[PDB]
Design a protein around this nucleic acid. Structure first.
Lengths: 151, 140, 102, 177, 138, 66, 60, 71
RNA sequence: UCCAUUGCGACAACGAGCGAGACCCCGGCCGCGGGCGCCGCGGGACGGCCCGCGGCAGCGGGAGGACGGCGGGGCGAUAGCAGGUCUGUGAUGCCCUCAGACGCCCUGGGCCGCACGCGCGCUACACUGGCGGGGCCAGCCGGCGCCCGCCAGGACGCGCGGAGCCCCCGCCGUGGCCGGGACCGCGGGCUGGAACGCCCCCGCGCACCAGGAAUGUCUUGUAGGCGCCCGCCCCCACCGCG
């Protein structure tokens, strides 16, 4: 569902000033950013409501941290494809943060905000290298192996 | 604030502690066809807290049990389908279901089918593998 | 004009024999307007067989993959020009170039 | 923390465990998916609340469900707030110090001193192990029990499983003194 | 926006309550004695389940529009695990008859109109969903 | 950690024997650029070429003190 | 009696014969600050602070 | 071990007993009084209907209830 | 010293090789060119830098950076061993059965028989759960429509589409209970020439309330938990490979 040619071309017309992609565990969240209503929209729904409900503060992590100033005056048409739930919620937060860094554009505050972003929680800026593993013969798991009968 | 305890429904004692639909799942231990509902269609809701049930409700449930095909209870449901002698759908409950079980095993005994041999030889006619089944059962 | 978009579908197991053929298709059809290559997502034919001819020992399996490569081009040019392109393109034995008419 | 419990005046008295319990970086909820296990002591700066929410996920039937653990911490930390009238975060940060033994026995049996990390690591582990047993075949919730173990230990009681475990490692240690 | 800007449950609960009073849907008894699918051991214990399920069916149809889902595919979103056997649990599917009936009631109301392949939401239906979400849009 | 193998080691000396001024004491990219001048030093694969350069950087660092 | 806090200056090595135990040079945290060896289970690094109930016993 | 699903004249005694608390869960009543959680659940639905209590958290599994003033 | 006969150092040794590594495959990141479909080629990471401690090879720590100190695989030396396979082959020496056949076909049955002891598993012993509805979500890589049917499925069509765990709300309320689904009595279907195979539905609700001596496997996208796909297949996965 991710890594597809329809990334976020769902939007008809609607040219967008800034673009960012945040990814975690076979999930790509690509946000189309333009100066809008201070509104963050993921999967056609508002940022306020997402499926892992105890993770809502995480999906909005820099709204509290960076400062609502940049968040006001911005429209984000984020779409997440791939993964399950937590993978998507970490990937929206990565995408939203990088899009705002691009939104400062020319003032050095993109560097200052990235400094703030690496401080509260890195991964808001950087990718989570941890990705997945491969099953190998002689075990249901990859690292795990089968029981030996006679030692 | 109101309750009654054991009901003498069909030689059983249904505790008022139970939530009624779950309670009548055990009728004398054998024969429920209501499939955990189908008594709402005859009369009352799932959580009647068992004891709350009135004598008036009891007769209506008891009526549906004798005439099963009357309240949306279909032939797809019901304990017994075409009977080997009766050839009609029916619901068998309490002592009667076990009594009818004897009647069918007598039939297999007279007919001397492989199933009849295994039923008197205490062996499984369905569960295919008997090499490693009853350990500690110590039986033939 | 008998002008039709002409389909060109190339299947090469060898990425480099197939990739060089993609350069060949582009050059001959530069004149007749060949299309940029839409590379098929690789289709991997996967067979896992026990390495042992007799099934005894530790379980060792062979993971065998045929990573067929298909590249598709479309040319809206003359049939004689499509034909010149087939003669012009490098012939690599064991490479499938297939044409359909749209 | 949970939008209800603040993180400002919560510190611990023990200076031996001063660096090990992290009280300056708790996220809004304890999720913060991180490679804390990777590197030797990166686990020390993990937030105590994300160290507790990870401990509850044990026994397989309950493995991996961090969200079901997160609500169990917020249910426990909501119960503690009402009963104790002090920040629930503080009670966990106090209990971890209390549940930590200062002596163990290794063969070299012989008395040894547990390193700051181990006093924290066993302390969180003990808090959940008792709660898990004290809620296995009982009507009481795991969350209600989690709140009690977390609090009894902080004030300090041999009633608490974590302390009844600490107490015995240190009686066995005093035998091999 | 609108219906997706609204949480699912409140909209599904409310629209369902409206259908029963309005007379839209009107449940069939022969299908109202059955479990939602093979994967359910017990039939719905939520009382008027046809109404709530119908509310959800028209909430998915609204989002799909162009996709034009059929009866079986929309039943898949109500699929569950089949449990209670020595063999390991497997995700099965919901009963199509319940969903065919629900769709035929929306189709008769003209809320839904057929398309080549699957049926899709018609403007009378599209407005009904839009208006109800506008009814509780906060 | 990573222990240099005899190819990644003998070649590094051969590079510091032939070339002295071109490589510099703490300059991996420069040490990778000198070692990449085609025929003068030919190492197939960047992974081997990068590993050679790192050992050359370490050898060049050692010689500058003494 | 009352336990005395101490601070590791260095970890000399690992002992136990099964591994898993360490020899640490400890300096009492306060006052005369006695620097004496200690044996510790669990992961220990430099500058860690430990409280020793026994206190007098000395590692070799 | 055994509980009444079914309080009779002692429902007011229970109401006074639950009003005799600082905070409670319906499960805590099940331990404090020998009552099924379901009876305790229904009982506390009207305990806040009488307005002598309040929700602190509400989750499907457990809701913590603190008596408003009750002092 | 190392992960390593991996290197250092000492030293009648001095240099080489093979194996190790390098290489190959996939992955994370940047760029280029293309784009029915994300898919071709190039960079990038090297114990480079920094601080210690070291002649040294390196040994801990610090950042910077997708990525950090052998990422998850393939390949695999010199020798071997009475390991296993003549039942995979038009591989094969020898006895070659060779026509009332040990050839080759067809039917019927077995290979699945069960006082029992063991190996790999699965499902359990529940309130971190079962039971109802409400969201939503994958990846290997991926078809559906419509009507009839509780279902399982069937008829008739077209060109196409996606999990569970989890979450949200009720419910049961510690009861071998709605925990558990083993056995067995009807049926309804499927696939085939034919069930004995499977599916489904209404009964029926066994042991088991955490396991004795012992014994296994495992270091971050890990164990575990959860589903899905394929392999072989008329039907059928508690298996294997993913």
């Amino acid at each position: 569902d991710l890594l597809e040619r329809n990334d976020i071309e769902v939007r008809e017309r609607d040219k967008y000033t800034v673009h960012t992609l945040g990814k975690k565990k076979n999930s790509v969240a690509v946000a189309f950013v333009k100066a809008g209503k201070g509104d963050i929209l993921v999967n056609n729904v508002p940022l306020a409501l997402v499926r892992p409900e105890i993770l809502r503060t995480k999906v909005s992590e820099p709204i509290m941290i960076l400062g609502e100033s940049l968040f006001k005056g911005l429209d984000m048409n984020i779409k997440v494809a791939g993964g399950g739930h937590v993978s998507q919620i970490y990937a929206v937060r990565q995408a939203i943060s990088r899009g705002v860094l691009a939104s400062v554009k020319d003032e050095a505050a993109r560097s200052e905000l990235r400094a703030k972003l690496v401080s509260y929680d890195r991964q808001l800026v950087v990718s989570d290298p941890r990705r997945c593993e491969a099953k190998k013969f002689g075990g249901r798991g990859a690292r795990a192996r089968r029981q030996k009968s006679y030692r | 604030n109101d309750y009654r305890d054991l009901l003498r429904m069909f030689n059983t004692n249904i505790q008022g502690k139970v939530v009624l639909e779950c309670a009548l799942v055990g009728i004398k231990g054998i024969g429920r066809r209501f499939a955990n509902v189908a008594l709402k269609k005859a009369n009352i809701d799932v959580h009647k807290r068992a004891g709350e049930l009135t004598a008036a409700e009891e007769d209506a449930l008891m009526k549906v049990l004798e005439d099963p095909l009357s309240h949306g209870i279909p032939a797809w449901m019901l304990n017994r389908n075409n009977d080997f002698e009766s050839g009609k759908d029916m619901h068998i409950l309490v002592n009667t279901i076990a009594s009818t079980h004897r009647a069918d095993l007598e039939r297999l005994r007279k007919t001397r089918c492989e199933r009849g041999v295994r039923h008197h030889h205490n062996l499984k006619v369905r569960g295919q593998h008997t090499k490693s089944t009853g350990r500690r059962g110590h039986v033939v | 004009d008998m002008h039709q978009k002409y389909t060109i579908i190339v299947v090469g197991k060898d990425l480099k024999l197939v990739e060089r053929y993609v350069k060949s298709i582009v050059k001959e059809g530069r004149a007749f307007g060949i299309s940029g290559p839409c590379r098929a997502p690789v289709r991997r034919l996967t067979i896992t067989t026990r390495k042992s001819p007799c099934g005894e020992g530790t379980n060792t399996w062979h993971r065998f993959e045929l990573r067929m490569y298909k590249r598709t081009f479309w040319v809206t040019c003359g049939g004689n020009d499509i034909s010149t392109i087939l003669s012009k393109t490098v012939v690599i034995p064991g490479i499938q170039v297939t044409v359909e008419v749209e | 923390l949970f939008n209800k419990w603040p993180l400002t005046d919560v510190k611990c008295q023990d200076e031996s465990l001063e660096a090990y319990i992290s009280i300056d970086n708790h996220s809004f909820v304890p999720h913060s998916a991180g490679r804390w296990s990777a590197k030797r002591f990166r686990k020390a700066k993990c937030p105590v609340v994300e160290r507790l929410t990870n401990s509850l996920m044990m026994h397989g039937r309950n493995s991996g469900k961090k969200l079901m653990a997160m609500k169990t911490v917020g249910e426990a930390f909501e119960l503690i707030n009402l009963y104790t009238g002090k920040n629930p975060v503080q009670v966990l940060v106090d209990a971890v110090a209390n549940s930590g033994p200062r002596e163990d026995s290794c063969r070299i049996r012989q008395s040894v001193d547990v390193s700051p990390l181990r006093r924290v690591n066993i302390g969180i582990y003990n808090i959940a192990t008792g709660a898990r047993k004290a809620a296995f075949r009982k009507v009481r919730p795991f969350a209600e029990c989690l709140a009690e173990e977390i609090m009894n230990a902080a004030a300090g009681a041999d009633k608490s499983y974590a302390i009844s475990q600490r107490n015995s490692v240190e009686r066995i240690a005093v035998s091999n003194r | 926006s609108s219906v997706t800007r609204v949480p699912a449950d409140v909209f599904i609960n409310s629209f369902a309550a409206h259908l029963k009073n309005r007379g839209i849907i009107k449940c069939p008894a022969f299908t109202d004695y059955v479990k939602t699918g093979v994967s359910r051991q017990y039939a719905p214990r939520d009382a008027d389940w046809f109404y709530i399920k119908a509310a959800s069916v028209i909430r998915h149809f609204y989002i799909s529009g162009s996709h034009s889902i059929g009866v079986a595919g929309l039943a898949r979103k109500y699929s569950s695990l089949q449990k209670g056997k020595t063999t390991p649990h497997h995700t099965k599917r919901a009963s199509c008859k319940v969903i065919r009936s629900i769709v035929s009631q929306f189709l008769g109301q003209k809320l839904l109109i057929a398309g080549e392949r699957g049926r899709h939401i018609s403007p009378n239906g599209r407005k009904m969903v839009e208006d109800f979400a506008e009814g509780l849009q906060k | 950690g990573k222990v240099r193998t005899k190819t990644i080691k003998r070649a590094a000396r051969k590079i510091v024997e032939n070339n002295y001024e071109s490589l510099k004491p703490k300059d991996f990219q420069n040490n990778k650029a000198i070692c990449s001048k085609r025929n003068v030093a030919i190492i197939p694969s960047k992974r081997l070429r990068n590993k050679v350069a790192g050992y050359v950087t370490t050898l060049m660092n050692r010689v500058v003190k003494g | 009696p009352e336990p005395i806090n101490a601070r590791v200056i260095e970890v000399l090595g690992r002992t136990s014969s099964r591994g898993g135990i360490t020899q640490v040079k400890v300096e009492f945290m306060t006052g005369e600050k006695r620097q004496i060896i200690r044996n510790v289970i669990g992961p220990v690094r430099k500058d860690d602070i430990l409280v020793l109930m026994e206190s007098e016993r000395e590692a070799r | 071990k055994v509980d009444y699903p079914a309080d009779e004249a002692a429902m007011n005694e229970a109401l006074k007993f639950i009003k005799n608390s600082k905070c409670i869960t319906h499960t805590q009543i099940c331990e404090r009084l020998r009552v099924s959680v379901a009876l305790a659940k229904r009982v506390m639905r009207q305990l806040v209907k009488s307005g002598d209590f309040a929700i602190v958290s509400k989750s499907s599994r457990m809701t913590i209830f603190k008596n408003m003033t009750k002092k």
